[PDB]
Amino acid sequence: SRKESYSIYVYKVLKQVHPDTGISSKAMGIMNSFVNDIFERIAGEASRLAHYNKRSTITSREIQTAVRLLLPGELAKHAVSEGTKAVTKYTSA
Amino acid sequence: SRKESYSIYVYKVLKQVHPDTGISSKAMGIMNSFVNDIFERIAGEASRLAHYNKRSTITSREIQTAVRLLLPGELAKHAVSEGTKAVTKYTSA
Amino acid sequence: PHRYRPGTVALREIRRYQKSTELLIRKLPFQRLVREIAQDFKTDLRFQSSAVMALQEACEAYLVGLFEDTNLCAIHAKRVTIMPKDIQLARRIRGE
Amino acid sequence: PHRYRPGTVALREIRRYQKSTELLIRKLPFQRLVREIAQDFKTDLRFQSSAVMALQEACEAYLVGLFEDTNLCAIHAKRVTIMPKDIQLARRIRGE
Amino acid sequence: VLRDNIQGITKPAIRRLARRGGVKRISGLIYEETRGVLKVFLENVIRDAVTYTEHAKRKTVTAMDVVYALKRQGRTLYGFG
Amino acid sequence: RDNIQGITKPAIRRLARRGGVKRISGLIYEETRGVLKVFLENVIRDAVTYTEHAKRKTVTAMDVVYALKRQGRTLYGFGG
DNA sequence: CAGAATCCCGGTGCCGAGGCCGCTCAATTGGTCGTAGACAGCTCTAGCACCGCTTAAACGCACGTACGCGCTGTCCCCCGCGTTTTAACCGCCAAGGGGATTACTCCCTAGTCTCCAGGCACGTGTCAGATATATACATCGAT
DNA sequence: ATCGATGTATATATCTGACACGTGCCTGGAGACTAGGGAGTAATCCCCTTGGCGGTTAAAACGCGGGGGACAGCGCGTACGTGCGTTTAAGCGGTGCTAGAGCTGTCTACGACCAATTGAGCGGCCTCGGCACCGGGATTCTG
Secondary structure: OOOOOOHHHHHHHHHHHOOOOOOOHHHHHHHHHHHHHHHHHHHHHHHHHHHHOOOOOOOHHHHHHHHHHHOOHHHHHHHHHHHHHHHHHHHHO | OOOOOOHHHHHHHHHHHOOOOOOOHHHHHHHHHHHHHHHHHHHHHHHHHHHHOOOOOOOHHHHHHHHHHHOOHHHHHHHHHHHHHHHHHHHHO | OOOOOOOHHHHHHHHHHOOOOOOOOOHHHHHHHHHHHHOOOOOOOEEOHHHHHHHHHHHHHHHHHHHHHHHHHHHOOOOOEEOHHHHHHHHHHHOO | OOOOOOOHHHHHHHHHHHHOOOOOOOHHHHHHHHHHHHOOOOOOOEEOHHHHHHHHHHHHHHHHHHHHHHHHHHHHOOOOEEOHHHHHHHHHHHOO | OOOOOHHHOOHHHHHHHHHHOOOOEEOOOHHHHHHHHHHHHHHHHHHHHHHHHHHOOOOEEOHHHHHHHHHHOOOOOOOOO | OHHHHHOOHHHHHHHHHHOOOOEEOOOHHHHHHHHHHHHHHHHHHHHHHHHHHOOOOEEOHHHHHHHHHHHOOOOOOOOO
């Protein structure tokens, strides 16, 4: 019954980057499909890496390697930096 | 350690198609890789098809549809007959 | 009377149509074509109103991209008129 | 002495190398090049005897395919000699 | 049954599409080649869409079937969910 | 280093002959070297990334097979 | 119509394909039972059909000059042949860095009941964007 | 040396429903406890990858006779674009029905899981002939 989409979180980010702009439902549809696409690519690559090494669990090492492979050099460096920062804050919470 | 392979099965088939002909080691390695390649492609498509219908079990219908989607027309036309005959005989046993 | 020289209207149309975003093919003739072809596979098929739009968008984007590619191999021959062999060559090099 | 006209030997070589099957790149120069490039990412790396052969086979196949495509682009301009712009055009059309 | 509708893709629409692509001059034979290309393109997508439709035992072709069919060829299309 | 010069002109000619090229202009060599260098660089970066994830120090044939597989080309005959 | 280059008949001999033996652990038959999805029944979305008014678009047309194509012209970037001289080839021997396996053990995730609030529909309204009229002035064209 | 006929852009006032927001509510994320097996550690074995000495040649590098290709010119005729009147049917607005997508609801056919069993499979050693390499010969096709 109740559906599920990222429109709320996209709106929160939009209001944090630009608090004076709104977004049309047509743009919201593209933003919703974009997240499902990148999510599926990363989870796929992480599963292949885990299987080749004969490991039963997925850990941050798999995510970091997958990120280094799929994203270009400049996006990867920043994404990994803040990912590790977030993980450090969570583990230190 | 022990490594599994299909080499004995490839040889049995070759002896049935051409009893007087033999096969070198390189050809055995190529066929042994080709089989795993096609196996992963069909199992992959069957996996996607299972989730879109909310089904939890893979069945022969998924294999038949994947075969019709991946292989060209005439090859699929013959292969589907082979699979149908095999399953029918197995169930009749 | 008044009459423009060859090519000025063509350039004005190019500058016009690259700025706009509307669809260029007629909706109804295309819907008829889609219901024409699908019947060779199965009878009594029905199409949701959005499916025909999705097919039209994919087809228009595909033809536009094919013409963009065809133009590059057309200029290479020091010509300005595009001809069938340019489409055939582009499709051959693309591997389809 | 007997002398063949220009192109007779080229055709003979074409037939010879199309009929053969051996590798065409020297093993030592390629192995040194691979060891040189890898040094920029990580130092003191080691390579198995089969990994260098796999890289060699993949690179040789890729170059042969690119030359096959470039040959069509050369004939289209009514020329016989392939030129850098032909490679640049083939690569641009391929989307590399 | 429609005996023939593919004639309905008009010459002006083809000219307009070539214009969006920046084509300045068009030869008189491009129209029939373009019609043949478009028909060939549509058959390949429709066959898969129908294949998914039949697998689901549905009778109505849905936008999602076209999205998955396009995805299998690598032409993911954004905007239709 | 000078190792890129190890791909001598005759090797390029042999490759072009296999492709059916009858006449070759003298500038094709530097372009071919440039095209090859970027391909090797791209494949090795992925191979080394897989090697480093496994904590190994020797690069095996499987790592190259997977790199090529990710780039979208499958190699038959070396394993997998 | 000469003859460089080619294809291949026939001899020696080798090491890889085929074949066998040894012995283990992946695959089989049997029993248990919890639940995924095959099925019937019911509902109401939107897709299919049908009609009349309007004019943007389409067809069919006239026509003239810009582009596609062709020969005559050329001059030099390369193909083929020979000598130098080489560093790539095999072949034999070094040797300890690293991969593969074993046994130990601890901390990590999966799995479970409890419970209460974040975010998924419905309703509302108002001002952002779609629209009509006027004109500054740039560009294209022939003289 | 030029100027005016066309087309684009921009400036202003009006309307109307798309999106932001407020009210409502329910199902799925957090708290808390537990079991164990998966992962992380050092030690050990052992084999193969990194390097050198040797030497004799397959292959690269150097000059040049001279060619047939890549490049340009002038020439010119007919394919295509631009400007127009007629008329088609898509577009839009509205009415009616129902095929069939979708959902709740019922229950049993199918599968996962444990255990003992055992032979099809892989590990290594052997051997012998299709292949491979060589020579000397007959035949091809270019020129």
